[PDB]
Symmetry: D2
Subunit: 390 residues, 4 copies
């Protein structure tokens, strides 16, 4: 009565809606996404259509209530990210930015006018957006950003100068959610659109992780922003971090799908591949590995479920997310890597996919807070003493 | 709004009864058990009273319905083991044998006569019992036991010959649940009592783990057992394993209490102890450690909860228990060990307790299935191929 | 008086010749190889010239005495592989095959005629060769190969049928050292040349490790081999394994150069990059990592030296090589991976190289005996009991 | 031709003297020490005779030239510590204090008068001494000690006040090498003798590591020290650290003997013990473990040799010692722990010794610089930036 595909019976913890949503999406991901990943990753191609397609299904910004959004549960959102990442982290990355980094901030910190004007377009996937926070000299430390936004009392607008790097979707984005430090000292959010004079977003080259994802910079040379494009609700790092926490939540779920794909591929390979007469799955060394993968995946899955439920209850704290994001991203990496080692020579061929996952999880464990930064965060909470600086 | 003592809010997942039971027991453990552990461990003393005391509280065999038993939930049983182990694994070990290895088998595989005759005595703690399975040459492999039970068609009884070693409570036990191989090939359970001619149970010496626990052998020299003392419900290893699974379930919870005590002690020490001017808790190396402990403890806690709920639903499978028992016992060990290292020189003094926990968890990770054996078990389930033998 | 670039003063353990050779080669590798690796790896381009160039320097098959070979020490050979791998594993791979897998077997198991005919050409780099052992269904287990060589009593020749896969250099090789099972049961070595009817060697596609290296198959459709092309000295797996051991020896050294490059890059990045005001190198978490890298590299370096000396003394045993190859390849991987994590977002850009090393070491830890296979080898030696099969 | 007891042939790297010394000592350790360890550890008994016995053999302070000392090599000193620790760390601890913490400082920083007066007595083992540096509030940070030594211009002497804790041998010592901070700010060394009014050294209780070793405090209540008892050569922490480095060197070797004993015991147990029909040594999981132990031991052994040679050449730097001490002590621990797990239930019985080693290595990895402190030391050297404080 034991099912290795669901050791602790996650299923009976999901509502019928949640289960329906997952199954529906999984179908799309396997029929439409999986078949285009081999070459999209191999040649760094990002199909812009993927956003329109997901736009149709109504998967973009699923937790938002209204404005053409499904208004589903945090758990469902997690289940979605898991099915997406089960195909490729690059894809899930685009869906994470669109949902938790663009739509969410506009929704939570924007004016109704902005909401009405953008939320529907984003939800349908007619507007590919991006989140501009990181800068060449500001990553783990955002209070060090150099992008300044000056106010023009006369024209009722701000002039932005700065450079954002390592930005997902920037190269082919229509809307840019940028954060700059103001003359008053506060850091606000600005909405920029392709075409604004002074705005350019070149592609980054030489990526060997999340290749099926578009990544570039956001260069602002005296870009002038109207006042109605200023996110009226965020006055400090609390705004971007609020968004970051919703993204990290989805990433915690996501990577588990990636891990699951590795476990399944490794397991099958162990059964089909044979050496020394019997199938690889007959050796003790191979089996212990499969055991460790399943073990870690399971602990992560049920922990994620809990957080999702606590979230919908407005009981989830930032630390809680740091805890699962840090854990799951790290563990996922080891699983991918063990999987790679288990396929032997074949393991280094994208034809077998594991290598693609191992490489993607490399970037995943880095962005949205590095593995160690999330530890200092937990540590500050545990001791009440900060240890980021000296 | 983040509480490091309950990251994912386990509390709101417990029923009022469960919470009451835990709090009630915790009080007993902290007022009556903690104050007698330093010297009991230091001098290998086991207070037989502890069983009578626990007998009063009605903690012995708590999941049993009737016969003077509380008839509580699997979760409550887990919460109890956790509070006990939070003091010492030796104590929890006695309570695990009494509840899941003696009372449970009598209850599940015994005759009403046996139930009526023993269950109440055991529940009140008037009878200290033990489980005799392991033998000098049979541990991970029980189908290799040498204890034979011959049938006496005439006297309607069996004569038992064999030796059981590493048995918890045997030295001061009144009832012995022994398993021997029969002439028909099946392995049944026999109930023995102190005083039976031919039965001796000497203490084992030189233990440096679970010292506050009594451990010895069960030597049977032609011990004659009446027919009414044969567990009529167990005809093969399914009987002992059935019991083993209920014990392992409690152990999965248990070790988490032990880990929690280590985390708390380490955390405090980090705050109170100071070097280089500031408190140890200010250093990055110290904080990351605290983070890792809390992380692992949390994943284990919520996984255990789930299993407990699935168990009460008669939906828990042996593999599920192997998964959490293996995980939690291993992780608990690392936590104890990190804790020890964090207290520095003081860490090797029982006066600071961590060293006692590190040593206890050593035996815990070994009995009731070694860390690796539980992996081969998971592996057999995952691949459908056995890898214990060649 | 402590030098982190040589903790235990390896230098004073090298003879003047050895040191000269290393320095000479290092110059070539840094001036000629490093500048062509970024794009060669990025676009899977292998410069055939690299072999001719190395041919000039006389680095090809350096331990061979005569036939236009330098006839240097095993240590010098190790020092060479280390400088090469310090640039890229792909390059070192080509030099390992040429030297220990092609030239060595011809030298040790060939006829003078063969030696005279090939050794000089190979040494000058006029003949790019390859070693064909692995097959689609035979990797860790070579006694399972399906490539058969039938004897033609009449024409005094053998007809070979089979497929070798994952072969380094095969796509642009001139000489092929192939091993097939014979009708007598023994497995011998055959020398094949491009152009032989029935012989094809297509490129393998989709590699995400050792990309600057050419890899393909060796397909033999009734390829007819003259008798004078049969390696007269190898009659069983002892031949290929003899060669394998010389290759593995160089790989043990090699990966250390790769690790060293990662340590240096990480260290510098830690000093130049700044967050939270100070340089990354100021944080405890960063420093411990640097410590662990240096520690492992050092142990490996001095162990390799010893083996090299024992080798030149004809005192080196296969197990000794398994021990260092397994160790160094595994440790190297962790170092590369930590390095990658330390550069943050930048770490996933080939522009920073670490990602290239992390990916290369993935294949390195797999070929020439997987990490676990080398463990079973050590284990057989330690216990005297084989554990490869059931 | 492969010998698992000496994978890389350490033997042929030792001079005839060194080998003779090792073999001679090993005989003493196995015939005189091993037979008294079971109960000495079990009952915390320290045989003072052990020092006299070692005094006879001339093993005390073996590197010292003159004053009744063997004047042997650093390597020989290492070989000695290894044979001693192969029996028990407690014993090696007494020999480390006597040699590198008492005799060495007197020799290097003392006056001829002091040398003449003590060195011979210590060498013969007529004077059991101890090193008093650590204090209740000063461990990893010695520049925080509170033991002050006031000068009495009149009586030409100093009055010492302070408390040293966790001191090896203090309870039954005759000579005390104590370090206190002076009114001039410098920290010097003082020689104290049992009987000095105001001096007491009570035993520490509740140790569960290094039990066969005597450990206590050094309480100084206005103890008056003559001027001729002041170590005239040490004026700051450079004195104690100089000594510390010689002790740490021996500890690096030492723990390897402890590891070796564990490997041998585990290996044998794997061959003799049988489950599931065959010997434990037949399982893949068991073999990989044995492989990892041997691997780590070997790397450590040859690294230690090198350092020893560099030391005798006056080319060894503090960092070099931190590197091997940190490495070997940590690795040794894992080996002991794996060994313990491999003996199963038996593993927790001192009757099988491994448990004793696992527990001893716990304290060893802590004193003479914790595992992490040695990392910050290496890190300071690698980056040139200190990270101990904020
Ligand atoms: C801020 C830190 C750097 C540390 O410096 P500190 O000085 O200690 O700042 P503090 O954190 O102490 O204070 C700053 C204010 O921020 C608030 N805060 C902190 N954490 C959170 C969370 N999780 N959610 C909401 N708000 C939060 C805090 O309460 C303060 O608020 P107010 O009172 O409202 O003013 C760190 O805590 C942190 O969170 N950042 C680390 C790096 C990071 O956040 N990088 C983001 C990367 S974006 C990305 O990767 C896009 C990828 C998407 N994709 O999937 O492709
Ligand atoms: C049996 C094994 C050794 C492996 O050999 P295998 O040949 O593969 O046996 P199989 O397992 O294939 O078959 C034997 C039968 O047993 C059944 N089985 C297996 N696992 C379970 C669980 N968890 N629960 C109930 N029944 C179980 C199985 O279905 C078969 O049943 P029937 O059809 O009914 O006849 C292994 O699976 C195992 O479970 N044992 C490992 C060692 C062990 O169990 N030791 C127990 C120690 S007791 C102890 O530590 C007391 C400490 C208490 N304390 O807290 O102090
Ligand atoms: C043979 C094994 C698979 C295990 O099966 P077993 O049944 O136990 O075989 P056995 O090993 O017991 O017996 C076979 C005979 O082989 C001999 N042997 C074993 N090891 C060695 C070494 N190291 N050197 C020389 N000879 C050796 C052995 O003494 C026997 O000899 P004779 O008496 O002379 O007849 C294993 O031991 C092994 O060595 N192979 C594992 C996989 C492997 O070797 N793959 C090679 C890959 S090639 C490659 O990766 C090219 C990459 C180059 N590059 O850098 O790009
Ligand atoms: C000093 C530290 C705490 C860090 O603080 P810092 O502010 O950075 O001090 P600094 O280290 O920067 O400066 C202090 C001076 O000390 C010198 N130093 C440092 N390391 C060494 C070594 N290895 N050998 C000789 N001299 C050394 C340094 O060059 C300075 O010298 P001068 O110019 O001559 O004046 C740390 O570096 C350290 O070494 N100590 C860590 C803890 C420790 O040393 N504990 C000792 C325990 S004793 C024991 O365990 C007995 C057990 C025996 N047994 O086997 O049973
Ligand atoms: C594929 C990809 C897509 C990305 N997409 C986006 C996007 O859409 N939007 C956006 O805003 N950003 C994005 N980023 C960047 C990401 O958010 C930043 O990488 C991350 O916040 C910070 O790291 P960093 O690159 O600046 O490196 P750093 O912050 O410089 O860190 C480098 C290393 O140093 C460590 N470190 C830093 N500070 C400390 C400390 N105090 N103590 C101990 N260790 C420390 C880190 O843990 C890490 O190991 C992306 C990155 C990748 C790789
Ligand atoms: C304090 C304490 C109390 C105990 N109390 C009881 C009690 O009350 N009742 C009872 O019946 N028993 C009891 N036991 C014993 C316990 O159940 C047995 O230790 C356990 O089932 C088996 O291990 P073993 O000691 O026989 O060692 P082994 O089974 O011999 O195993 C030794 C080592 O070998 C490994 N191993 C074994 N087989 C394999 C394989 N096929 N593949 C790979 N590795 C393998 C193990 O994982 C372990 O690392 C107790 C033990 C301790 C230490
Ligand atoms: C870039 C690259 C270049 C290569 N170049 C060459 C070349 O020039 N010449 C040549 O002959 N070959 C070459 N190879 C192939 C290499 O030698 C084979 O990959 C290796 O010997 C065996 O692995 P495999 O791919 O067959 O996988 P497998 O042997 O099938 O192994 C797969 C996984 O199963 C494990 N496994 C296998 N058997 C056991 C067991 N009994 N117990 C426990 N675990 C087991 C392995 O450890 C591994 O994790 C190359 C491979 C790569 C990736
Ligand atoms: C059996 C035994 C015998 C001993 N014998 C002697 C003897 O003969 N003579 C003598 O002088 N001393 C002796 N000592 C004590 C030993 O030298 C001290 O334990 C050691 O120098 C320091 O640790 P501590 O106990 O003070 O703990 P702490 O220094 O307080 O450290 C506690 C924990 O905090 C960590 N820590 C401390 N500072 C930092 C930091 N800045 N950053 C990150 N982590 C940090 C440590 O690594 C450790 O994990 C003995 C100890 C034992 C256990």
């Amino acid at each position: 009565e034991f099912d290795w595909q669901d050791p602790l019976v996650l299923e009976e913890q999901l509502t019928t809606d949640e289960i329906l949503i997952r199954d529906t999406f999984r179908t799309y991901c396997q029929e439409r996404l999986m078949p285009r990943i081999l070459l999209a990753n191999r040649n760094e191609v990002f199909h812009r259509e993927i956003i329109s397609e997901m736009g149709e299904l109504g998967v973009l910004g699923p937790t938002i209530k209204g404005y053409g959004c499904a208004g589903v549960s945090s758990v469902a959102y997690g289940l979605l990210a898991r099915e997406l990442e089960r195909v490729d982290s690059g894809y899930r990355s685009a869906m994470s930015v669109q949902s938790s980094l663009v739509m969410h901030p506009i929704y939570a910190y924007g004016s109704e006018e902005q909401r009405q004007k953008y939320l529907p377009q984003l939800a349908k996937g007619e507007l590919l957006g991006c989140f501009g926070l990181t800068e060449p000299n500001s990553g783990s430390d955002p209070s060090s950003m150099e992008t300044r936004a000056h106010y023009n009392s006369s024209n009722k607008s701000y002039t932005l100068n700065g450079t954002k790097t390592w930005i997902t979707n920037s190269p082919m984005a229509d809307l840019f959610v940028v954060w700059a430090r103001c003359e008053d000292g506060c850091i606000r959010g600005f909405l920029l659109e392709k075409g604004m004079r002074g705005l350019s977003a070149p592609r980054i080259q030489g990526k060997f992780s999340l290749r099926a994802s578009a990544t570039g910079m956001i260069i602002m040379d005296g870009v002038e922003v109207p006042e109605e494009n200023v996110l009226p609700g965020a006055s400090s790092l609390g705004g971007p971090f609020g968004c970051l926490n919703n993204a990290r939540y989805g990433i915690a779920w996501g990577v588990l799908g990636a891990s699951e794909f590795c476990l399944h591929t490794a397991r099958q390979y162990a059964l089909d591949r044979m050496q020394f007469g019997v199938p690889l799955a007959r050796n003790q060394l191979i089996q212990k590995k499969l055991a460790d993968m399943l073990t870690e995946i399971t602990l992560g899955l049920h922990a994620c479920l809990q957080l999702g439920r606590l979230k919908d209850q407005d009981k989830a704290a930032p630390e809680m997310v740091s805890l699962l994001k840090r854990n799951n991203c790290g563990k996922a990496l080891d699983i991918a890597r063990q999987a790679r080692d288990m396929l032997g020579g074949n393991g280094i061929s994208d034809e077998y996919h594991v290598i693609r996952h191992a490489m993607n999880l490399e970037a995943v464990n880095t962005y949205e807070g590095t593995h160690d930064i999330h530890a200092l965060i937990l540590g500050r909470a545990i001791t009440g003493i900060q240890a980021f600086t000296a």
